Structure formats: C-alpha cells, structure tokens
C-alpha cells in the first residue's frame, strides 16, 4: 500500500540514525585510547545526522524547492520566539544569580551575619555555572545545566519556607516563623519556568527494573538477568 | 480472518523490529558525553 510504505520508510530512517550514533560513540572511545587506523579524521564525529539520511533529505528538499517554483524590531517583531540555539530560561538564570550574589553580600555587610553572604554567593556560583552550560541546549551538558539550576532553586525555596533565614529572627515566636517572602517566590517561579519549557533530558536514569516489569516481556535472557539481580536466580521459569 | 502473514517480507521485518524495541529501553542519550571530551590538553 501507500500506508505500509510510510511505516517502512520511517523504520529505515530511525534505524540508520541509531546506528550512526552508536558508531560515533564507539569511535570516540576507540580514538581516545589510541586504537584507530590513522586514516581516521576526528572531524567525522561532528556530523550529527547520518550520511544516508542527509543525502535523502537534501535530494527531496531540492526537488520540492525546484518543482514548486515553476525592544522593538519592525522588520521581524517575533525575534524572541526563534531557535537561537540556547535554552529559553538562560538569561533569567544569570539575572537571578547576580541578584542573589549582590543581595547576599550587601545584607551580610549591612548587618554582620555570615550566612546571607555564604548562601548568596554559593547559589550565585552554582547558578552562573548552570547558566553557562545552558547556552547550548542540544548537548548533554546543556541538559545537566537545567537539572543543576532546578536543584539549586528548589533548595532555596525549601530553606526559605521550612527553616527561614538567620538574620530574620525576632523577639516573639510567631513573628519569627518561616514564611514565603520574595526570594522564595522568585525561586519558585524559576522552578516552574524550567519545568514548563524543557527538562526532559537524561531520561534513562531511574530506578532499575523490577521482576514485575519483565513478567510479560518477550525475552528470556533479559528476564533471567533481572531475576538474578533481584535475588530470584533459583526460581523455576515455567514459561 | 487473518491474511497469512508469516510468508511475507514487510511484515517479518516490522514484526522483528517491533518486538526487539518493545523488549527494553534502548535510548542512550547520556553516552554521548564522550563526544564533548575529544580535545583536552591535560
């Protein structure tokens, strides 16, 4: 049909891509440790697509473009919604890092307490590093950056709403209760912004599979491996 | 009815591929970090 042809084309495309990526990784490893046959050019590891799929795409696209042609910026106003290559929440992260650092140092000089500057400059360092890594979102560091920033903002929100700050003690007891103010609110807004833009990388890190997930799997070797790891290596597989 | 699928060639490939992919997660996005370490003068 013209329906099973589409399925077949997509299967071939995906398989060619997966194989190219596995080659790139294994070649990077074999090269970093000497064993490579010296006609090898280490620039071939920057070609992301695949040679075959790239050629198909190029030919199809040129056929299309051939047979079909038988602040404020007035020229293009929607420049912010354009794929520039970084994470959307990248300048906000650096802005918040600068605010945290400045406020922490100012407070700890104006009063005499040593926790404000330590927390402020620690968070500032971590958030500047995350906002540096977030300047190329396709890489692996581009995703670990987002994860690091989310962790730091969550910890800030936690310290604010559950333990409070040392320089905010009062004489009373309900006057000095840990509540959410403006720093915790900004950190919460940042966490929501990371979650609702993109934080989906490194999804293969989780808790390992159970014997409950492989009960119905079609693989005997895999099921045996999982049972072995969880302590059931001697049970009988009447399957 | 059933269309006599076992003597065919598109269905055999798609069958084998779907079963293999449904066995276990095969995406390895975190192994690519080695591709960002090929130049280090240490």
């Amino acid at each position: 049909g013209d329906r099973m042809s589409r399925r077949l084309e997509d299967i071939n495309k995906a398989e060619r891509q997966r194989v190219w990526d596995a080659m790139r990784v294994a070649a990077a490893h074999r090269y970093a440790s000497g064993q490579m046959p010296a006609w090898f050019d280490p620039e071939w590891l920057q070609q992301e697509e695949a040679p075959l799929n790239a050629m198909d795409r190029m030919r199809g696209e040129q056929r299309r473009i051939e047979e079909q042609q038988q602040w404020w910026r007035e020229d293009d106003p929607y420049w912010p919604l354009r794929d520039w290559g970084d994470h959307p929440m990248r300048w906000w992260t650096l802005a918040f890092a600068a605010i945290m650092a400045a406020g922490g140092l100012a407070t700890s000089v104006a009063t005499g307490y040593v926790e404000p500057v330590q927390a402020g400059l620690g968070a500032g360092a971590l958030l500047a590093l995350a906002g540096a890594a977030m300047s190329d979102a396709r890489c692996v560091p581009g995703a670990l950056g987002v994860k690091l920033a989310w962790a730091v903002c969550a910890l800030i929100v936690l310290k604010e709403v559950s333990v409070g700050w040392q320089h905010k003690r009062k004489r009373r007891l309900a006057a000095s209760a840990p509540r959410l103010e403006l720093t915790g609110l900004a950190a919460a807004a940042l966490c929501a912004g990371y979650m609702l833009t993109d934080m989906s990388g490194m999804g293969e890190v989780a808790l390992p599979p159970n014997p409950g997930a492989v009960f119905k799997s079609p693989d005997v070797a895999y099921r045996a491996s999982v049972w072995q790891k969880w302590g059931y290596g001697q049970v009988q597989m009447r399957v | 009815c059933l269309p006599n699928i076992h003597t065919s060639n598109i269905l055999n490939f798609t069958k084998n591929y779907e079963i293999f992919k449904s066995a276990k997660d095969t995406s390895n996005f975190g192994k690519k970090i080695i591709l960002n370490e090929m130049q280090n003068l240490t």
């Binding site: 280490p42 620039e43 | 130049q39 003068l41």
Partner: peptide
C-alpha cells in the same frame, strides 16, 4: 559565533599527534 572553532581544531590536530 564559532570564533575559536578553527583555532581549536588546528591546535588539537597539531599538538596530540
């Protein structure tokens, strides 16, 4: 952008051979 691309490529080629 990509301002140190060529420099880094040349350097890594010439140093670690």
């Amino acid at each position: 952008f990509g301002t140190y691309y060529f420099l880094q490529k040349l350097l890594s080629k010439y140093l670690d051979v």
